[PDB]
């Protein structure tokens, strides 16, 4: 009701409805450490919060007090907990609370407590109907907001809403093929539905990725996905891949490609391939290409990788 | 800023 910035706002110490409650002050002893200075209004709201909290008063006035405490500091996890306690005690309309939290999160999309609160509400209502759209909006002011993606995966998993995610992913990847969060989301969807064992799917994916790589050859995310879905089956078990990559080298070269090649070669040496000594050289030759000219910042690393390959296959 | 809590 009465807003904290309303011209007619009144301190709780001056409110009749609160006359019976004795405010409880905070005290950091003789020598306070990392003490935050608070305004009259701030200290007032919280001195009463402590009072109500201390008495576990499940009142309607307490519920309203939390709104103010949250406005002053939405990072106070205790306030949110108590608010949830009250939500139940007073049997408040949860659909209304959903609107409340939706607004709060928009204003503070990087606050841990607000996302946790929304998740609890959705569990209570067992209603995920407005989640995917809400998250999409938040992802609009920050397509990489870890909190948003985390909440999104929870909803999708908990209420089995996979039907449209792969499409959502395809759309976001078009908006920014470099968004590592979306590539992860893609893998999340697929591995939780069809899986990658269906050679039809694996092929579709490897093809899809090579296409994205051709559009923006310098994109760690795309390369990581490609290697990710194949590294466990065995990179060397895909003869046509090695050559298709070697063909890109001329026009679509990048340290990512070179690295991929080094990894392919190492998988071969790993599986006692033909031309052990010859392959190892192709690898080493690349490691050096990386160190000396392709990925110089990691020069010492690549050289370290090379020395490791030599002392392992000679 | 990096809010970790």
């Amino acid at each position: 009701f009465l807003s904290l910035d309303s011209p007619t706002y009144v301190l709780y110490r001056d409110r009749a409805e609160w006359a019976d409650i004795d405010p409880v002050p905070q005290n950091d002893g003789p020598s306070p450490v990392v003490q935050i200075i608070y305004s009259e209004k701030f200290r007032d709201v919280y001195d009463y919060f402590r009072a109500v909290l201390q008495r576990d008063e499940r009142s309607e006035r307490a519920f309203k007090l939390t709104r103010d405490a949250i406005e002053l500091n939405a990072a106070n996890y205790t306030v949110w907990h108590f608010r949830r306690v009250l939500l139940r005690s007073l049997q408040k309309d949860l659909q209304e609370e959903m609107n409340y939290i939706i607004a709060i999160i928009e204003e503070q999309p990087k606050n841990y407590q607000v996302w946790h609160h929304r998740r609890v509400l959705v569990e209570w209502l067992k209603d995920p109907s407005q989640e995917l759209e809400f998250i999409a909006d938040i992802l609009n002011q920050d397509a990489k907001n870890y909190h948003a993606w985390q909440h999104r995966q929870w909803v999708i998993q908990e209420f089995r809403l996979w039907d449209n995610e792969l499409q959502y992913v395809d759309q976001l990847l078009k908006e920014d093929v470099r968004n590592n969060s979306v590539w992860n989301q893609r893998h999340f969807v697929i591995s939780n539905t069809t899986g990658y064992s269906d050679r039809a799917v694996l092929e579709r994916e490897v093809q899809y990725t090579l296409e994205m790589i051709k559009l923006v050859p310098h994109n760690e995310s795309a390369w990581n996905y490609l290697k990710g879905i194949l590294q466990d089956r065995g990179l060397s078990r895909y003869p046509n891949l090695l050559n298709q990559l070697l063909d890109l080298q001329p026009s679509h070269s990048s340290p990512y490609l070179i690295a991929f090649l080094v990894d392919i070669y190492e998988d071969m040496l790993e599986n006692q391939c033909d031309n052990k000594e010859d392959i190892l050289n192709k690898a080493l030759e690349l490691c050096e290409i990386l160190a000396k000219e392709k990925d110089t910042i990691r020069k010492e690393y690549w050289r370290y990788i090379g020395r490791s390959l030599q002392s392992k296959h000679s | 800023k990096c809010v970790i809590f």
């Binding site: 409880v24 002050p25 905070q26 005290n27 950091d28 002893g29 003789p30 020598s31 306070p32 450490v33 990392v34 003490q35 935050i36 200075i37 608070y38 305004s39 701030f42 919280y46 402590r50 009072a51 909290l53 576990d56 002053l72 500091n73 990072a75 106070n76 996890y77 205790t78 907990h81 841990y112 946790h116 609890v120 990489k144 870890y146 993606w149 985390q150 995966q153 470099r178 968004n179 590592n180 992860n184 591995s191 939780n192 994109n219 760690e220 995310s221 990581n224 996905y225 290697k227 990710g228 590294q231 910042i297 990691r298 010492e300 690393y301 370290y304 | 800023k1 990096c2 970790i4 809590f5």
Partner: protein, 346 residues
């Protein structure tokens, strides 16, 4: 440029003193701010500029001790601050009941950590009560929550639990098998570690995961050599000049520690480019007020001031103690802890 060491000492000093109402959102995490400042001074070898005794009393006043009836064991540990209004009590008298007073895993961690840094011997810490509280926080999947009343759960708290067990030198505080399971399951297809299974691998969670395993002394036992090589690759790929927390994300000073420390634990930080990293970290140094920011020409804070310094430490900056990459305290302090543990064992 150069490291304005004294400027940074003053910065941490001010942090321990008073903060602008602008930092009100850190109220319940004040103990972690204290940690950044104290451990920060420790790292700069300037703990003398503060009154170790006063601060130790303040810290102990944040411990949630078991009540007479010991009916609140599952809620013991440390508070982030005195925000609940409980009367100041430096762990002198028994616990005073309160419907909503409980510890917070990150505060119990930073609390103990601070006490050790300040030279206290943890004699006033109800080790068993804390461990009891810790256990109560672990979930079926092995991860942890921050408070018994409930909260989100992820790798951040797994690291906190690990640090607590390690410092109290007692792993009864967790079901290590389940914790390790959680850590493994968080590894992504790109080989980094995420906050939880299926999530995007991230520099922060990777540090938390690897560091936890190292603290348990099971790194080699949990990940295969092939696996560790893949993890190393993912980490080393985070360096652009400074370090970012995720592929295609801008660098941020604090990752010079998050990722840097991971690389150090994996014994390959030595192969990173020191100069570009150091240069970036310094570019975020506030030459006027002191401390560091996440990005250059940006306001500094305790977190980035501390982690920027620890990042410099990883490369043995002239004038900065060596930071213990897994425990997040100076090696000097990690040692005083070794002695402390020996003491007990008698």
């Amino acid at each position: 440029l150069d490291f304005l060491r004294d400027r940074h000492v003053r910065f941490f000093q001010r942090c321990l003193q008073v903060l602008p109402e602008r930092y009100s959102s850190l109220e319940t995490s004040r103990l972690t701010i204290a940690f950044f400042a104290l451990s920060g001074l420790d790292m700069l070898d300037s703990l003398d500029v503060v009154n170790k005794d006063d601060i130790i009393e303040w810290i102990y006043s944040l411990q949630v001790l078991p009540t007479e009836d010991r009916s609140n064991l599952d809620r013991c540990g440390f508070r982030g601050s005195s925000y609940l209004g409980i009367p100041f009590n430096p762990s002198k008298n028994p616990g005073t009941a309160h419907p909503y007073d409980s510890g917070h895993i990150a505060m119990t961690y930073t609390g103990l950590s601070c006490l050790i840094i300040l030279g206290d011997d943890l004699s006033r810490v109800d080790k068993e009560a804390c461990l009891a509280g810790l256990r109560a926080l672990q979930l079926e999947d092995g991860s942890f929550c921050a408070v018994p009343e409930g909260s989100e759960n992820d790798m951040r708290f797994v690291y906190c639990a690990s640090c607590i067990c390690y410092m109290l030198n007692n792993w009864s505080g967790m079901d290590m098998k389940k914790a390790i399971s959680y850590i493994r399951r968080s590894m992504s297809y790109d080989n980094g570690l995420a906050q939880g299974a299926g999530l995007e691998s991230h520099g922060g969670s990777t540090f938390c995961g690897i560091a936890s395993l190292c603290l348990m002394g099971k790194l080699e036992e949990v990940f295969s050599e092939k696996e560790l090589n893949r993890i190393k690759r993912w980490c080393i790929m985070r360096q652009q000049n400074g370090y970012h927390g995720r592929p295609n994300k801008p660098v941020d000073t604090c990752y010079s520690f998050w990722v840097g420390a991971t690389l150090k634990l994996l014994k390959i930080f030595q192969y990173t480019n020191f100069e570009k990293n150091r240069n970036y970290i310094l570019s975020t140094q506030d030459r006027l007020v002191g401390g560091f920011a996440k990005w250059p020409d940006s306001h500094p804070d305790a977190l980035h001031a501390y982690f920027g310094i620890c990042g410099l430490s990883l490369m043995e900056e002239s004038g900065i103690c060596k930071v213990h990459p897994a425990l997040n305290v100076s090696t000097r302090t990690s040692e005083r802890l070794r002695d402390l543990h020996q003491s007990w064992k008698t």
